[PDB]
Amino acid sequence: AVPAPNQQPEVFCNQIFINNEWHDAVSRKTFPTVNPSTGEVICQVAEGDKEDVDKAVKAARAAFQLGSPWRRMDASHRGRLLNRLADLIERDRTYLAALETLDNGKPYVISYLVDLDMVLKCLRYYAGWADKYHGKTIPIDGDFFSYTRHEPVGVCGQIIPWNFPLLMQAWKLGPALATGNVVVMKVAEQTPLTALYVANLIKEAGFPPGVVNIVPGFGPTAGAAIASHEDVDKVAFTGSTEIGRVIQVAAGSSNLKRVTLELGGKSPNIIMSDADMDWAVEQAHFALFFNQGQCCCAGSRTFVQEDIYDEFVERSVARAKSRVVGNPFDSKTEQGPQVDETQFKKILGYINTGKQEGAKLLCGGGIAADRGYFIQPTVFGDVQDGMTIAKEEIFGPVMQILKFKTIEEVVGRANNSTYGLAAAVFTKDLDKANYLSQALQAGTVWVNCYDVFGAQSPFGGYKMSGSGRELGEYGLQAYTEVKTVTVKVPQKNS
Amino acid sequence: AVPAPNQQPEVFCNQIFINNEWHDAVSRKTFPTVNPSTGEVICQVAEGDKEDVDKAVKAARAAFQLGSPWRRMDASHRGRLLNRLADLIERDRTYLAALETLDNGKPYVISYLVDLDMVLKCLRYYAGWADKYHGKTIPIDGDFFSYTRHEPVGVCGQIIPWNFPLLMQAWKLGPALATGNVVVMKVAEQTPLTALYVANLIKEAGFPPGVVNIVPGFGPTAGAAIASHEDVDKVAFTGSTEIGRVIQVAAGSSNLKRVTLELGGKSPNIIMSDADMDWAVEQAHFALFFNQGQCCCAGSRTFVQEDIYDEFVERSVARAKSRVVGNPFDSKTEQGPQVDETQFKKILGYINTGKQEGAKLLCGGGIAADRGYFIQPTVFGDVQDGMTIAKEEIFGPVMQILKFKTIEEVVGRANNSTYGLAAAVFTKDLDKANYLSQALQAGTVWVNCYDVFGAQSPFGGYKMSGSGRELGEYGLQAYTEVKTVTVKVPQKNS
Amino acid sequence: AVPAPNQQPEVFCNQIFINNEWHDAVSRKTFPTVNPSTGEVICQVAEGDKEDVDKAVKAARAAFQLGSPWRRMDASHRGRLLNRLADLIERDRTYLAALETLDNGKPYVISYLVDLDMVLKCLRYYAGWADKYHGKTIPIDGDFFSYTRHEPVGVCGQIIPWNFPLLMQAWKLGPALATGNVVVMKVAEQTPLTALYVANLIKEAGFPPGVVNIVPGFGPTAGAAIASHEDVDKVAFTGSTEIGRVIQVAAGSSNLKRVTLELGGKSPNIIMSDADMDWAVEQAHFALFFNQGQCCCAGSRTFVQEDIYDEFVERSVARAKSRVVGNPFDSKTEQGPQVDETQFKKILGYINTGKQEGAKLLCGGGIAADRGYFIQPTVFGDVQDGMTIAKEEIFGPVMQILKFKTIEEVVGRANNSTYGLAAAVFTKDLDKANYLSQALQAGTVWVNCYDVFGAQSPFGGYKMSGSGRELGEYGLQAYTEVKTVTVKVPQKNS
Amino acid sequence: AVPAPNQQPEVFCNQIFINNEWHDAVSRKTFPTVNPSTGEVICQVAEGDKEDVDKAVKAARAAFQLGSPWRRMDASHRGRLLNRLADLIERDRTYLAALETLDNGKPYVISYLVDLDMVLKCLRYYAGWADKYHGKTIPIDGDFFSYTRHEPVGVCGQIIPWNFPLLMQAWKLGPALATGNVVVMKVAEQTPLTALYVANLIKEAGFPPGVVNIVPGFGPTAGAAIASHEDVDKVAFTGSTEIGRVIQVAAGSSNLKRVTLELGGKSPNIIMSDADMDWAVEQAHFALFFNQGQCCCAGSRTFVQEDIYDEFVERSVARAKSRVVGNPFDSKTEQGPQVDETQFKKILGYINTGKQEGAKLLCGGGIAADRGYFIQPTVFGDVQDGMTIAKEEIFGPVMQILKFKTIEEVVGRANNSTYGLAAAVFTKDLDKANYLSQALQAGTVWVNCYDVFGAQSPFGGYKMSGSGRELGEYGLQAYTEVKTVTVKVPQKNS
Ligand SMILES: O=C1C(=O)N(Cc2ccccc2)c2ccccc21
Ligand SMILES: O=C1C(=O)N(Cc2ccccc2)c2ccccc21
Ligand code: NA
Ligand code: NA
Ligand code: NA
Ligand code: NA
Secondary structure, X not given: OOOOOOOOOOOOOOOEEEOOEEEOOOOOOEEEEEEOOOOEEEEEEEOEOHHHHHHHHHHHHHHOOOOOXXXXXXXXXXXXXXXXXHHHHHHOHHHHHHHHHHHXXXXXXHHHHHHHHHHHHHHHHHHOOOOOOOEEEEOOOOOEEEEEXXXXXXXXXXEOOOOOHHHHHHHHHHHHHHOOOEEEEEOOOOOOHHHHHHHHHHHHHOOOOOOEEXXXXXXXXXXXXXXXXXXXXXXXXXXXXXXXXXXXXXXXXXXXXXXXXXXXXXXXXXXXXXXXXXXXXXXXXXXHHHHHHOOXXXXXXXXXXXXXXXXXXXXXXXXXHOOOEOOOOOOOOOEOOOOXXXXXXXXXXXXXXXXXXXXXEEEOOOEOOOOOOOEOOEEEEOXXXXXXXXXXXXXXXXXXXXXXXXXXXXXXXXXXXXXXXXXXXXXXXXXXXXXXXXHOOOOEEEEOOXXXXXXXXXXXXXXXXXXXXXXXXXXXXXXXXXXEEEEEOXXXXX | OOOOOOOOOOOOOXXXXXXXXXXXXXXXXXXXXXXXXXXEEEEEEEOEOHHHHHHHHHHHHHHHOOOOHHHHOOHHHHHHHHHHHHHHHHHOHHHHHHHHHHHHOOOHHHHHHHHHHHHHHHHHHHHHHOOOOOEEEEOOOOOEEEEEEEEEOOEEEXXXXXXXXXXXXHHXXXXXXXXXXXXXXXXXXXXXXXXXXXXXXXXXXXXXXXXXXXXXXXXXXXXXXHHHOOOOOEEEEEOOHHHHHHHHHHHHHOOOOEEEEEOOOOOEEEEOOOOOHHHHHHHHHHHHHHHHHOOOOOOOEEEEEOOOHHHHHHHHHHHHHHOOEOOOOOOOOOEOOOOOHHXXXXXXXXXXXXHHHOOEEEEOOOEOOOOOOOEOOEEEEOOOOOOHHHHOOOOOOEEEEEEEXXXXXXXXXXXXXOEEOEEEEEOOEHHHHHHHHHHOOOOEEEEOOOOOOOOOOOXXXXXXXXXXXXXXXXXXXXXXXXXXXXXXXXXXXX | OOOOOOOOOOOOOOOEEEOOXXXXXXXXXXXXXXOOOOOOEEEEEEOEOHHHHHHHHHHHHHHOOOXXXXXXXXXXXXXXXXXXXXXXXHHOHHHHHHHHHHHOOOOHHHHXXXXXXXXXXXXXXXXXXXXXXXXXXXXXXXXXXXXXXXXXXXXXXXXXXXXXXXXXXXXXXXXXXXXXXXXXXXXXXXXXXXXXHHHHHHHXXXXXXXXXXXXXEOHHHHHHXXXXXXXXXXXXXXXXHHHHHHHHHHHHOOOOOEOOEEOOOOOEEEEOOOOOHHHHHHXXXXXXXXXXXXXXXXXXXXXXXXXXXXXXXXXXXXXXXXXXXXXXXXOXXXXXXXXXXXXXXXXXXXXXXXXXXXXXXXXXXXEOOOOOOOEOOEEEEOOOOOOHHHHOOOOOOEEEEEEEOOHHHHHHHHHOOOOOOEEEEEOOEHHHHHHHHHHOOOOEEEEOOOOOOOOOOOEEOOOOOEEOEEOOOOOOOOOEEEEEEEEEOOOOOO | OOOOOOOOOOOOOOOEEEOOEEEOOOOOOEEEEEEOOOOEEEEEEEOEOHHHHHHHHHHHHHHOOOOOXXXXXXXXXXXXXXXHHHHHHHHOHHHHHHHHHHHHOOOHHHHHHHHHHHHHHHHHHHHHHOOOOOEEEEXXXXXXXXXXXXXXXXXXXXXXXXXXXXXXXXXXXXXXXXXXXXXEEEOOOOOHHHHHHHHHHHHHHXXXXXXXXXXXXXXXXXXXXXXXXXXXXXXEEEOOHHHHHHHHHHHHHHOOOEEEEEOOOOOXXXXXXXXXXXXXXXXXXXXXXXXXXXXOOOOOOEEEEOOOHHHHHHHHHHHHHHOOEOOOOOOOOOEOOOOOHHHHHHHHHHHHHHHHOOOEEEEOOOOOOOOOOOOOOEEEEOOOOOOOOOOOOOOOOEEOEEEEOOHXXXXXXXXXXOOOOEEEEEOOEHHHHHHHHHHOOOOEEEEOOOOOOOOOOOEOOOOOOOOOOEOOOOHHHHOEEEEEEEEXXXXXXX
């Protein structure tokens, strides 16, 4: 059911992509990109700066010209070009699953079955929207005819993160291009390969010159350049809440460009006593350990009800110690390395403070190999709301288990965060599921599951987890501008 | 707290309504409407036949004419009129509720608080839609601009039944008038009175003449004249499954007019073992005995799981025996009389048929008063699928209780029926409520409740319970005609 | 962009198509299908009837069983099967554009570049709708949670005409399968071949057995068997009016199956004094002479304003004589023959009836070749409303030009007609296009163009040209059954 | 016919409105609001600071608590409450108009017939939306049922300007309250009077306490206090760019709250050649001078074709010259005074800068009156692009007239302002209509009319002019939080 991977794939693209050609930086500066399993360097990558972002934007501003072949083309053809791009990604599935694992470190089995599959369904879901987002004819008062046009907002700066580098890419390109925009994309320094290669596939799909430009570089230079740029019409950022504050400040101190954001979470997974014990344990484990725990809506607060707390813990611990950490290309590996040096140390430091503040280390706690950035699956029990490990997104394989008495208690506690990206309820009981699904403050609630995304279901956050929505039809709003036309007519008849 | 009803309200409106003016029938014929509590004549009503229907349709067509006040009026204003109409019905709420009880027989208290409240809410809900039913601007291939207009269908023939006279009038006028149509209404000869007094309010509210015309009379005459009329663009019938067939034929025979039907049902009410026993009993009883059993969506097939069957039956019988039958102007009464002698005899026959086929009579099953049309609340136990009473709609205070073992069994048993209006499920388990709400072939699935309609939420039949939908946004579709305008433009840009 | 055709291409498919397998009739009868260029028998095709249809429905029913492969399949997958089909038809597009031109009669060039291009656009448009036709969540009164599900209607009997036998097939199958219904299709006896080959691509595409089915034959037996089947949920019929009335009666007398119909037309094309003379002239010509005059919205009433009547008429008569008539496989040819001899003689009888009534035959006349069914492009001048060639659907290469004086005049003259499928308006003025496009009683109004369809923009008939719509989001409405689920929840909070 | 004014209306409310009750500030300070038609301080108004904004916010948060009267109300009831409010405003229509004119400058015949007309239509339209904004059920892959809830975004801080006081209050409360939010409102220091009277009606209508809260104060203080609160979920600014780019920074600096904006513009009113002259002149004259020229999308870049400039410009000055200035309570008065001193000398400051660098002054010139902030209607001609008068928004009765040649030319010129809130196109010809509306960058494009706002049609600007739209179905998005619930089910069917 899963083909073999090439474990040392050839890197073809490592430059700034503009007008469908390859560029070295103005400054000529470069940066190495590392393989988190061994810690070794994979290759050098073009470090895009202030003025390389300025270049990317002009080739994009020109792709968006009234009369240009992109502004003119049929909406259903923009679909045809999206579908084409997914056909070719499907063709190079193995190589793209392998390359993602080499630079990101996720198990190869997941790259192929999870990432790239959801890459395919997403792109093919937006292809079919290309010619289906309607404006309105509006029965205004008086002798007028009025109607709306959902036009493209224009040149869209997209800054994407390192955890799901292909899936984030497609989540951003999905709607932008479906709706006729053009995109200046900044890839994460950590994982910039897979994205640049798809830029070759964006060429071969048939996308006009400058529809898509991709600028590798650092946050404080490239990232902040796009956010400040006086001719960029919109900027979408996913990543830490810290860094989102700089993105919304620059966007106000520039050109009143629209903003969207998808920041972290401390998402509660709430297990009522009537849950299916066995289902809830495999799902709470998956909800936190998935993708090495580098998940914006990782279930990092596992709230369990007292009547069942002890059995749940003992099982979670057992499941945690039996999780295989190892070579992400090996078929049996359930957990690969963290993403870089910086994340490795950050996590160890959280584990440290979990220990300092009196949480019960129940397994793991340590470095899981001699080479790479592998951390042991770690579970803390008896966690209290006031502990640092119960307020801050670790973004690693560290589970926190909290005990609750009543449903009115757990709702107040669960909802007691600066974040609200996601939450989940486990229960067999209909009133319970309904009360909680309504009372919880989260962009997405899951009932008897976790991380169930489809390209169809919208996704975003409340509070300081972000604003606006990705996936589904809602994803289209923030990439659309509304124009109203109101025409005097001889005599309005119903 | 309901005000004190005048038990003999005066009748001010007993003629044909055309062009905001009152008329005798061309033949000057009248028929008597009866009080089913007493069996005595309230008054004589004008008998509309073909000539009168043709007059009404002509008035209606004249009002639909391009450049008429009704066609030039702003859509927001159609909404003001419905709000004004709603406020006049509230002003006169005490009289109408007394008149409904007099003519139809339902308890004054139910008429005041259930029926009259739903009329106001339905009319208020549709007042809001009037300027909110958008067409679409469509992203079509080539250098064209394309858009839809939701234009009214035109002259709408509406035929309303007798079980809920005022409410049915609002469910048909509400969505027809909000979209800008004009109506010719046939009200039932058992209960024409409330509808003619509302026509009086229609005029006060300011509706241009000919927008609503109402013809009291008989069905095989006035009702068929509407269905066969060459200048009627649409017919909405609610009534017996048998007459609905006649309505769809005449419409095929005449001018291919549009059709939506609401017909009878034999709705399943399903009760699992883990349902809250006392809530289920009180609801099941209401589901069947409401409005004297005279409900298209009546829970006339109460399946009950074997572990709780005995206790359920014993409780259900008890509440059946304490249900109070008598004068509907008295606040102690929960059940007035059936609407007329025909339905009376029909129900008397259906109970005898019950006894013949081997259903167990557990209470009632005979006559309750020496005058009027009162029948005792009847319960039949150990009912089997093959029994005539399990298969055909009595439309009376006669409960059928059947027994089942597994959830899967009862899905096929509930569904195997040519009717599919509504259904209900009583349980506490999330999974079972979803399984069954998915599997039942019914236009409405109530979970742990029954007879809960919103002005906001669609209602209608599967199979031979009908086609088309009533209330919500969906109620507007069958009253709208789509026009596509496709203009050549110089050069299409996104 | 046009290949070369095998002009007696191998017929692999001429039987009944049930469960992705082929069959003879239960009677073992057959009938011939004729080439309209030559009149010779292309092959035999099995003659289905009540018996076979009854076997199709029973396969369609079983593929629609709850828990079947087609029912449980993801919504996104139905889209993949449709998109695949489009890819297969594109791979046999050359064999199909030829076999279309062969059996129907139209010019290979028009067959390949118009028909199949639209067929591919149709199928890929509807592919995308598959996972996009949302139900709603509804903020009802009280402590309830209320939502709707858009569910398939079931087994849909589909009956298609001979004038666009591929495209008509695609217009029906697209919507039906995207929303997951099962089909029992009767095809035209004059053009069954194409529909049958596409079925083999349906199997090859991977659609489960019993999902899409086909029964070639004669309407007065098989056609009407689909129409009256106790277990067909829906009968879409395209064709004449007379048959549509028969259909709507067959539904009324049987299981109350829903019904949409696409029927005839006498569409007006209206030239204002300030139109673009050359464009208008060339568009008017195509508007009637497209597909040998066998289009439902053929602009078969050309209204011309009096200041330009003379100027317009000569050009049109000149343009009509210039129109090459010959073998459709040739490339000089702009017009091929009529579909069969029954129409051949009908149109001839219409042309006599024209001269006889005093219309000025201005060019053309009768037969245009001594083999096949070829007729001369024919213009009648000075035409009047009371003339049979201005009221009845000729369905052939006969123009009609009529003089008007005022915009108020032509409104009334264009509407005064029992059909309402399409109309067109030619003008440079803004107020005039708006005045006319509002005031014309047509399901589609084209402005400075004609015949501009697309899977996107909806199509259907006012009055007696149809009920219900095809194409766009509107097509899905007829193929969906709406279900309301209303759930009692603990406490409703906004 | 317009009811008799009260030239010096009584004043009742001048304090801070919190929890349905009145309060003076913490510092107990006040300030003056001027009758700008004389210049005499009308009355004193509590000067609000940060700490009173923090009391309103706490009052709103309590009102927004799960289980509170507001959060548990039926969506339909909120609609009932908005309609109630509109009925209270309508009963007081005479007096509110008078109070508005007093503190604002605008003529009584506009305050009553237009501003208040628009207030009423807006509230009533939104009352209709209260229970019709639906979420979605979504056909996701796998055995899940996924659905979206459209939830209140939360505590919304609402700052409105002085140029259309009451209306702008109406545009904010309507959508926000229909969707169940709670309001913290900062009215203008210049015009706090009307907007504070409405709160008294809000109490009377019966809105629970803290749903709406209103704080008169300062731009440097109150404005940024709301913008920076850690408990304000969302803030909507309406004003100018300078002031609007502070709001975007302080919101990010606080808690990443949602921001919608409405800002200034330099709206281009393009009069074409083949257009009508009587209508264009009168309307182009309407586009700017309305409401004493204090008008965000006022038309001040008038591109005339060089076939008509002279003859167009001729009539343009006469009407402008003849435009009456005077007492705002005299029915012949079209134009009133400006609202404050700053604007007065600033508008005079704008005048000077024009002629300086080549601009012909055609009438008015300067100060209209001895007493007040009045201004004679000034008009310029010969204006070129790069001047102060054709780049910066004057917000006063000061017309600019420019000149163009070809149709491609004027586009680029029209699309060269750092703004784009509205635009217009006076033409007769369909193509010039469809082209110019299709390629002008603007939120609204009025054709042959100007300042046509329906309560139904969305309204907001391109680029720097604003984010999101106000009015229409798009007004509700800003006030809505989207939650997805995704439930595991037994077996997903279609
Ligand atoms: O935790 C996450 C996650 O954040 N994303 C993507 C995402 C990115 C930003 C915001 C929300 C979701 C995922 C996709 C698949 C499985 C788990 C997850
Ligand atoms: O010209 C305008 C205008 O700009 N506004 C308000 C507005 C505010 C911000 C953005 C756009 C319009 C108006 C309100 C009423 C009547 C005329 C007008
Ligand atoms: Na790395
Ligand atoms: Na009666
Ligand atoms: Na043939
Ligand atoms: Na004054």
